[PDB]
């Protein structure tokens, strides 16, 4: 009872050239604004539907009708993340297995344990920024990346990257960044066999070895003893099959966590810092809460949760630019979406989170303005209207940890510094598969409080 | 005595790679934002200084200290616009000659003369928008180009480009456009002799030929009309008694054609953008238009009384002045602002968009579209607002442009309600001028007839 | 029974294999590696490349196979339309134009074109006389000026005046660029990517350029009624015996484009190649120059005299054997059939004759296939049937074979009569490939023998 | 002064630099020489040089009392990872004459007898690889010559086993070297080396030097764990004026130097010979003839390698037509006049186009392009300085005897054991790094069924 909108198609190439930007997500957003809540996007070999209104999004988040689909994006990341929690299909050996082995390791009770090491990495950042000279500035995404990676490596696997002791990035991080870019780059390749991509292929494998070799370096330090993320993997057993996780799979989970945490949380903080320096009154409300609550030289686990405004900023940043901008679904059985669009079994849907988070119908007509005050009552927001961490059983396992980190770090930054948008930086959002601000720089004057 | 800041330089290429964007002006504004009111900009074989605070620009506008310089930009334009007014040196032969011959034709008294022909073109645009079907949209920069170009050919030269009767741009307009891109592109070539730049060198001569050709049919076909073109054929220099030679005239026509259509097309487009982005201001101007434009066709008198429409235009050109910069050189040794010593011949660049963002002058809300700043146009300090250049070398076409945009904007506001149906994000395309790219709207006609 | 096929790249088949600027030569190397036949697959199409006289002989059976419009020719049809070269044998305008024009390329017709042919030829000789001592000759560039001017004057009584220019006629640059675009579409897997927008639009403008002067020439003569006895009046006045009607204006415009392109592209390459092999084989140059001197006894050559340069004709034939400027033609099986007892073909299957490789079939030419020996052709009937097909086959064979040979023989004769040629650069053969073949950096210096015209 | 020197087409401030914007610079300089003759000026943005091609001028330029070895722009770029090694050092630099006198013993004819055995080891591995191929397959000639030449210099020279024949994608070191060498050539064409577009290139290059210094600098320690080899001569030899052995970092520069120069020159050299053999079947016959007659043991003897006279002649005739290191550079020690026609300021640069020298028609006769190895039957008939494939003077190629022995040995064994088919009718295509090798050259080989 409704023909679905579709953008300009270029011959046999369908809609693919339309996402021949350096900014595909943002290109999909611009399409969403022109065609409305749902549009078909077909490329050679695949077809999908992108949804942008909460009315259709809530139905797709009905777990009896739709199951998580591996988007072409995720299908290409699977070539180095394999059977990890992020890139495994729901119905498959290790998803449920790893899911129940690892879920205890991220429940609110796990956070109390990670808190000490999180603080460690957070002081290094504060000390680095403290120790900068006057004429210097801060490269925000890079230092957030230094932070996030160091924090997961210590909390999760008790491995010290020492990112703050390095100027050129780590070999691992560069391979991870190059691998993700390649996964993205395969989306626009109309035929991946063309010889033009031979060097691109050769490097892809060279970086997969670099990561896969290095992760086993993490494994060497232990069997050759501490309440940590890795221990649960080598040591937790399935209640039905009795076994632990395979050595090959434990690998993929590590790659997954390293990639997921360091990438998603880097954008998150950077965006929060971006929005703070652009909204100085919000900064004021957030900076004062920092001083009043963070009364110790270093924070305690209990003190973090009181930062009720710092948390609101983070959520409001994540509303506007969700660092994992999309998740994919398929129909378990034949169905009708919204009484208008019939779906055959196996058809793919794409939830375009940033555009869902821009539904005026839900948020009012100031969808675009950075106002953390929307979130004082998280309970007024309808169901499936704010889904930055996915949905259902395949929802983000790393939510409670990421939020702990972001709120922790942001608090200490606001407690210890004031930040000047000394360049009048125009937001430039880089798209690998995640989103991050690119070239964001600030200067920070230390408030002269000791640690 | 104050040492001047300079951004990052790359070996023998100096600051040249920093502008290896498709957006140099915008990249320079970014540099201005990091380095402050003035910075030195070095390229291979050249040096200039970019000024951004009203403190420095006011000095540089002393016609006793500084004269108009042909920036590297304009030096490349001189290859197809030659010694026309825009691309002339002040003291060269044809400038003051041509300037004093033509000023009468851009005086306020000529406007009453052009007004009919201007209305003619504007009715065409309005009828084009009325005749769209419901599902269709409007391509704003492209239709402003049809409008601005057709307007000057009819007012100036009684030539009908018929852009509204065409879907791919006119062959003249496209070569004229491609010539501008090459002038810009020559800015970025570290060595223009490289054979990679040979296909370009060939297209360039063909485009110069295309425009030079079209003009000469207009100019020769004349040898009964009181317009810019006969003023050129008949105007006489009071010292030598002769008109401009046919070559210089050709150069004036080319100059005007591009200069008007490029700046005025961008300008109207920016106004439409800022209006759809601030609907109260659209409301007030729409209300103001409806009350004043009370006849089926607007009159010359009524256009001076679209006082709010004019304020909008002033506020848009404040934000994005479609001709974004002018250049100056020091006539003799001096110090600029007590801090920066300058040798004779040293170059200055007025970065008009950054000047219009000097919080010191405009307040702390610079980035806001508020036409009410232009209630009292006398309230604004001198040398704070330079959209039309400066001095004797200031835009000779200010009235005509202002008259044009104001007439056109008003009729659109009287005749349509406009929908930003795509939530268009501003993307400003750079030739040498500025212009929004991909700006589209939907327009529902108010069914007022013409 | 299973046919060789070169290396395939995923869903892209063999197409990346000849993403060179020189496809024919890459195909010549596939044939060298894989032999008399190999399958060449592209997205959406399949063809078989044949190189042995054994298979070509069957492929020339007009009762079994007909002329196919190769993918290449399919793209040329975008501006050569319904011209003789790009017509299907069963299309309406083919047989029509064919029976109408054949007299205009006959031998009695050549006697008529000869003088205007001579006209362009003196223009070439004088330009070469009037050069100063230091300069060289840009050989392909001057052969192009000559061949184009000759077809325009002989065919259409139109003067391009190429010798009075440095920028080629505005038209020939389009005509050349259209050919390059036609060639360029061969390697584009996705023809729709927006990157080919400047290409596809420049293309449409170049077609506008060619049609303008061709429709001007065809209209300008439909007013002066002038009885030049040339291709153009023969097209305007000749009538089809079945419909009683002459060729439509749209179709004539296509034959002109066809003839301008066909003559200028094939013959200039041909002359260029002959001259290359001559300056590279000085003993052969001597014999031809001697025959040139002995026969060209008049201030300007006469038609009877041209018949008589038997050795330059053998040179020309030996040149077109090594590098046939039009390197391939295509056929399809009119019905299901088996080729050479090993390869069954369904009706409609496409075959491609790789003429350069055919002309190197050692079992036919002997063990010295690559040496330039014009003495192979002094007994022309000794050559087996379908062993030497530089002009195609059967009813679809080149209509301009005679006209071209006359031009080349005449022109080459005069060059040898009037100059001594020096390979002052030791030019290494570098063959540019558009749709036809021609050498690229070829230059020589020529000392005038001071014989007058 | 008498004679204004020719100069090819100039592109404004970019001079004639665009003339070598091929992937085949050397071949372009030949095409220019063929039209402008025995000498021409070649200008670049920051430099000017003169190319010599006639034996007449080259005989003068090889006067060691007037000219010395210059570092061409090319060799200046190799100096970034080969540093102070013999190939990239100035004569008056402190490590040249130092390293030169300690190493001459390791390449004297006397030294060869020792290298002979390990030379054979790698030589059989190659023969075994070819023997074990199935019939439908072919031989990728440059790749297998690169495998051999590198394994031989690495084994015979430093007792390190690369084991190239046990891998299909090339060694990381060799892939890094070739990419480092490619970067050196790639710079020659950049009139803007500061431009940001070259950041990934500058990055990768810096990573590639680390790769070489990694393995090589480990090898110097890995031996301190002493036999009689090139590395031992470097670790143990003493300079008589300061009495010191070579610098630890200088040795790293020599090893890198020797690995590259050998593997790049010798592999190219063998490949070219094989091309000429399969293209000249009668020469192939006579060459396999002597091979069959002399190579009478399951393994070659040192004496026997010397007793191949025609195989050596094919080698000489191969390097004549395509000398794998095609050029060397010189500077004027003082002001002087070249050929009585061209005056030179002190410090002016000369480039010898060895391929063009080796085509000087007045010297070799008019069949200069023909592959005729019998030109080398009487080597004393060849004029002094007409045939300089190994450079000139004290700066002459130190390894020419090692190289000739390897090429003679290997080429001999190939001719004994296989018959070769140009089964694809391969057209000669020259890959240019700084050195010259042929590309995509392939043959099929039918075994003569003979054991080792
Ligand atoms: C470590 C970590 C950290 C994190 C964080 C984050 C942030 C900030 C954001 C986010 C997100 C997300 N996630 Fe996240 N995260 C993580 C993780 C993860 C994992 C493992 C996963 C998978 C799970 C399942 O489902 O199985 C996720 C998950 C996730 C999601 C979903 C996806 C789909 O496709 O559905 C989302 C949307 N994550 N996230
Ligand atoms: C027609 C026309 C129109 C116009 C418009 C306009 C607009 C809208 C804006 C503008 C601007 C300008 N201008 Fe303009 N305009 C014109 C023009 C002109 C001229 C001619 C000139 C030059 C002047 C003199 O000096 O003479 C100008 C001018 C001008 C200027 C200045 C330049 C310099 O460098 O100095 C500026 C800034 N404009 N504009
Ligand atoms: C005008 C002219 C001239 C010429 C020349 C020549 C030369 C030198 C060479 C040649 C060739 C040829 N052709 Fe040549 N030609 C011509 C033409 C022609 C035509 C029209 C054709 C088609 C035919 C029919 O079909 O009808 C030809 C044709 C021809 C051929 C065939 C085609 C196919 O596809 O088969 C060939 C191979 N052609 N050719
Ligand atoms: C081991 C080795 C091996 C070799 C080989 C060879 C071959 C096959 C060829 C050759 C070559 C040469 N080298 Fe030689 N080689 C070597 C080496 C060398 C050295 C070390 C050098 C340097 C020495 C001097 O001079 O000091 C050379 C050296 C050489 C030379 C010279 C360089 C210049 O710059 O002068 C030449 C030309 N190589 N090579």
Kindly write down the DSSP assignment for every residue of D346-409, as one continuous string.
TT-EEEEEHHHHTT-HHHH-TTTTS--GGGGSSGGGSPTTS--TT--GGGS-TTHHHHHHHHHH
User: Which residues in B151-187 are b (16+ Cβ under 10 Å) and which e?
Assistant: bbbbbbbbbebebeeeeebbebbebbbbbbbbbbbbb
Tell me if A398 sits within 8 A of A258, measured CB to CB. no
Q: Is A419 helix (H, G, I), strand (E, B) or coil?
A: strand
Handedness of CA A203, A205, A211, A214 (dihedral sign): negative
State the Cα–Cα distance between residues A32 and B422, nearest whole angstrom.
Answer: 9
Instruction: Tell me which residue in A34, A424, A426 faces B422 most closely, judged by beta carbons.
Output: A34
**Tokens encoding D110:** 């006397």
Kindly write down the DSSP assignment for every residue of C411-442, as one continuous string.
HHHHHHHHEEEE-TT-PPP-EEESSSEEESS-
- On whether any CB of chain D is under 8 Å from the CB of B233, the answer is no
Gap from B424 CA to chain A (nearest CA, Å): 8
State the Cα–Cα distance between residues B230 and B253, nearest whole angstrom.
Answer: 12
Do the chains contact at C193 and A12, CB–CB below 8 Å?
no
Using alpha carbons, select from C248, C165, C255 the residue that is nearest to residue C210: C255
- What's the residue count for chain C? 453
Ligand nearest to the CA of A92: 1
State the Cα–Cα distance between residues A312 and A375, nearest whole angstrom.
Answer: 6
- Which chains does A contact via 3+ CB–CB distances below 8 A? B, C
Look-up of token digits 């020690």? D333
Kindly write down the DSSP assignment for every residue of C153-220, as one continuous string.
HHHHS----GGG-SSPPHHHHHHHHHHHHHHHHHH-S-S-SGGGHHHHHHHHHHHHHHHHHHHHHHHH
Which domains occur in chain B, in start order?
A: 1-450 (1.10.630.10)
Using alpha carbons, select from B268, B278, B352 the residue that is nearest to residue B310: B268
D17: closest chain B residue by CA:
B194
Instruction: Tell me which residue in D31, D35, D424 faces C33 most closely, judged by beta carbons.
Output: D424
Tell me if A388 sits within 8 A of A353, measured CB to CB. yes
**Which residues in chain A (164-193) have CB-CB distances under 8 A to chain B?**
none
- On whether any CB of chain D is under 8 Å from the CB of C29, the answer is yes
Look-up of token digits 């104001």? B406
What is the 3-class SS of B56-104, one letter each residue? HHHHHCCCCCEEEECCHHHHHHHHHHCCCHHHCCCCCHHHHHHHHHHHH
- Which chains does C contact via 3+ CB–CB distances below 8 A? A, D
- What's the residue count for chain B? 450
- Respond yes or no: is residue D156 known to be catalytic: no
Using alpha carbons, select from A311, A318, A396, A319 the residue that is nearest to residue A357: A319
**Tokens encoding C186:** 């061969």
Give C193's contacts in chain A (Cβ within 8 Å): 10, 13, 17, 190
**Tokens encoding C60:** 């020339």
Distance A265 CA to ligand 4 centre (A): 56
| Rama region for B168: left / alpha / beta (φ>0; ψ in -120 to 50; rest) | beta
Distance D74 CA to ligand 4 centre (A): 14
Instruction: Tell me which residue in B33, B423, B425 faces A424 most closely, judged by beta carbons.
Output: B33
Binding-site members of D for heme are 397
Four-point Cα dihedral B193, B194, B195, B197, nearest 10: -80
- With a CB cutoff of 8 Å and minimum separation 6, the contacts of C164 are none
Look-up of token digits 């040329």? C76
User: Which residues in A151-173 are b (16+ Cβ under 10 Å) and which e?
Assistant: bbbbbbbbbebebeeeeebbebb
Sheet of C419-422, strands arranged across = C137-138, C443-448, C419-422
User: Which residues in A180-198 are b (16+ Cβ under 10 Å) and which e?
Assistant: bbbbbbbbeebbbbbeebe
State the Cα–Cα distance between residues C398 and C84, nearest whole angstrom.
Answer: 9
Using alpha carbons, select from C147, C106, C130 the residue that is nearest to residue C403: C106
- Respond yes or no: is residue A86 known to be catalytic: no
- With a CB cutoff of 8 Å and minimum separation 6, the contacts of D310 are D286, D287, D289, D290, D373
- Respond yes or no: is residue C60 known to be catalytic: no
Q: Which atom of ligand 2 is nearest to the CA of B321?
A: 9
The strand pairing partners of C37, in sequence order, are C50
Using alpha carbons, select from D322, D323, D313 the residue that is nearest to residue D373: D313
Do the chains contact at D35 and C428, CB–CB below 8 Å?
no
Does B273 belong to an annotated binding site? no
**Helix H or strand E encompassing B137:** none
Q: Distance of CA B229 to CAs B100, B155, B221, B222, C39, Å? A: 15, 9, 11, 9, 68
Which residue among the candidates B39, B161, B395, B433 is catalytic per the annotation?
A: B395
State the Cα–Cα distance between residues D97 and D90, nearest whole angstrom.
Answer: 9
- Which chains does B contact via 3+ CB–CB distances below 8 A? A, D
Ligand nearest to the CA of A151: 1
Pocket test for ligand 1, best of A92, A398, A410, A433 (most atoms within 8 A of CB): A398
CA-based end-to-end distance of chain B: 64
D193: closest chain B residue by CA:
B11
What is the 3-class SS of C19-40, one letter each residue? CCCCHHHHHHHHHHHHCCEEEE
- With a CB cutoff of 8 Å and minimum separation 6, the contacts of C343 are C1, C3, C37, C48
The residues lining ligand 4, judged by C-beta closer than 6 Å to any ligand atom, are: D 69, 86-87, 100, 257-258, 261-262, 265-266, 269, 324-325, 328, 390-391, 395, 397-399, 403
Do the chains contact at A12 and C194, CB–CB below 8 Å?
no
Distance D253 CA to ligand 4 centre (A): 14
Tell me if C80 sits within 8 A of C261, measured CB to CB. yes
Q: Distance of CA D50 to CAs D8, D40, D386, Å? A: 12, 6, 19
Tell me if B309 sits within 8 A of B413, measured CB to CB. yes
Which residue among the candidates C47, C266, C325, C409 is catalytic per the annotation?
A: C266
> How was this model experimentally determined?
X-ray
Q: Is D152 helix (H, G, I), strand (E, B) or coil?
A: helix
Tell me if B391 sits within 8 A of B61, measured CB to CB. yes
Tell me if C320 sits within 8 A of C398, measured CB to CB. no
- With a CB cutoff of 8 Å and minimum separation 6, the contacts of D46 are none
Using alpha carbons, select from B351, B437, B442, B447 the residue that is nearest to residue B145: B437
SS3 content of chain A, % helix, strand, coil (to 5): 55, 10, 35
Tell me if B273 sits within 8 A of B439, measured CB to CB. yes
Using alpha carbons, select from C425, C433, C395 the residue that is nearest to residue C67: C395
B357: closest chain A residue by CA:
A424
A14: closest chain C residue by CA:
C192
C44: closest chain A residue by CA:
A12
Which residue among the candidates A145, A323, A386, A396 is catalytic per the annotation?
A: A396
Ligand nearest to the CA of B73: 2
> Gaps after which residues in chain A, C–N over 2.5 Å?
224
Strands D48-52 and D349-353: parallel
Look-up of token digits 């879920």? A103
**Helix H or strand E encompassing A366:** none
HSE-up of residue C39 (Cα within 13 Å, Cβ side): 16
Distance B393 CA to ligand 2 centre (A): 8
State the Cα–Cα distance between residues A263 and A435, nearest whole angstrom.
Answer: 8
Using alpha carbons, select from A388, A391, A357, A390 the residue that is nearest to residue A374: A357
- What's the residue count for chain D? 452
B263 lines ligand 2 (CB under 6 A): yes
The strand pairing partners of D419, in sequence order, are D446
**Tokens encoding C223:** 């007013």
**Which residues in chain C (366-395) have CB-CB distances under 8 A to chain A?**
none
State the Cα–Cα distance between residues A17 and C197, nearest whole angstrom.
Answer: 13
State the Cα–Cα distance between residues D207 and C8, nearest whole angstrom.
Answer: 34
- With a CB cutoff of 8 Å and minimum separation 6, the contacts of A174 are A207
Tell me if A278 sits within 8 A of A112, measured CB to CB. no
C-interface mutation test, from A13, A15, A191, A198, most C Cβ less than 10 A away: A191
Do the chains contact at B191 and D18, CB–CB below 8 Å?
no
Q: How buried is D266 (Cβ within 10 angstroms: 0-12 exposed, 13-18 middle, 19+ buried)?
A: buried
Helices and strands in chain B, H and E counts? 16, 12
Q: Which atom of ligand 4 is nearest to the CA of D354?
A: 37
Tell me if A384 sits within 8 A of A61, measured CB to CB. yes
B355 lines ligand 2 (CB under 6 A): no
> Residue of the nearest CA to atom 31 in ligand 3?
C392
How far is residue C381 CA from its own chain's centroid? 23
**Tokens encoding C8:** 């395939």
**Helix H or strand E encompassing B108:** helix B108-130
Using alpha carbons, select from D287, D282, D273, D289 the residue that is nearest to residue D322: D273
- On whether any CB of chain C is under 8 Å from the CB of A44, the answer is no
């Amino acid at each position: 009872i409704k023909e679905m909108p579709q953008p300009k198609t270029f011959g046999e190439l369908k809609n693919l050239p339309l996402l021949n930007t350096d900014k595909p997500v943002q290109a999909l957003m611009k399409i969403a604004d022109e065609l409305g809540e749902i549009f078909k996007f077909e490329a050679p070999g695949r077809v999908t539907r992108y949804l942008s209104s909460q009315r259709l999004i809530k139905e797709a988040c009905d777990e009896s009708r739709f199951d998580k689909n591996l988007s072409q994006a995720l299908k290409f990341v699977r070539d180095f993340a394999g059977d990890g929690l992020f890139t495994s299909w729901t119905h498959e050996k290790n998803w449920k297995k790893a899911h129940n082995i690892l879920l205890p390791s991220f429940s609110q009770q796990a956070m109390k344990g990670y808190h000490a090491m999180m603080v460690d990495i957070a002081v290094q950042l504060v000390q680095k920024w403290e120790r900068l000279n006057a004429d210097e500035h801060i490269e925000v995404p890079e230092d957030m990346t230094r932070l996030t990676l160091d924090t997961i490596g210590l909390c999760g696997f008790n491995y010290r990257f020492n990112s703050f002791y390095r100027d050129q990035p780590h070999p691992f991080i560069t391979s991870m960044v190059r691998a993700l870019d390649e996964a993205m780059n395969k989306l626009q390749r109309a035929n991946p066999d063309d010889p033009a991509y031979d060097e691109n292929k050769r490097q892809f494998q060279e970086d997969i070895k670099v990561m896969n070799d290095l992760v086993d370096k993490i494994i060497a330090d232990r069997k050759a003893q501490s309440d940590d993320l890795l221990t649960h993997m080598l040591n937790g057993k399935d209640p039905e099959t009795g076994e632990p996780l395979d050595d090959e799979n434990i690998r993929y989970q590590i790659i997954t966590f390293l990639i997921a945490f360091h990438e998603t949380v880097s954008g998150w903080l950077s965006f929060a810092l971006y929005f703070l320096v652009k909204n100085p009154h919000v900064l004021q409300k957030a900076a004062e809460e920092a001083a009043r609550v963070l009364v110790d030289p270093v924070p305690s686990y209990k003190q973090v949760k009181q930062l009720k405004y710092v948390g609101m900023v983070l959520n409001e940043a994540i509303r506007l630019w969700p660092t994992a901008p999309a998740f994919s679904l398929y129909a378990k059985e034949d169905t009708v979406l919204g009484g208008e669009y019939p779906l055959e079994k196996g058809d793919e849907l794409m939830v375009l989170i940033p555009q869902l988070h821009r539904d005026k119908t839900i948020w009012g007509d100031d969808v675009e303005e950075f106002r953390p005050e929307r979130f004082e009552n998280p309970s007024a927001i309808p169901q499936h209207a704010f889904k930055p961490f996915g949905n259902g059983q395949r929802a983000c396992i790393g939510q409670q940890m990421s939020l702990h980190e972001a709120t922790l770090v942001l608090g200490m930054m606001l407690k210890h510094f004031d930040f000047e948008d000394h360049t009048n930086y125009e937001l430039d959002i880089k798209e690998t598969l995640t989103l991050k601000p690119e070239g964001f720089v600030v200067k920070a004057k230390s408030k002269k409080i000791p640690l």
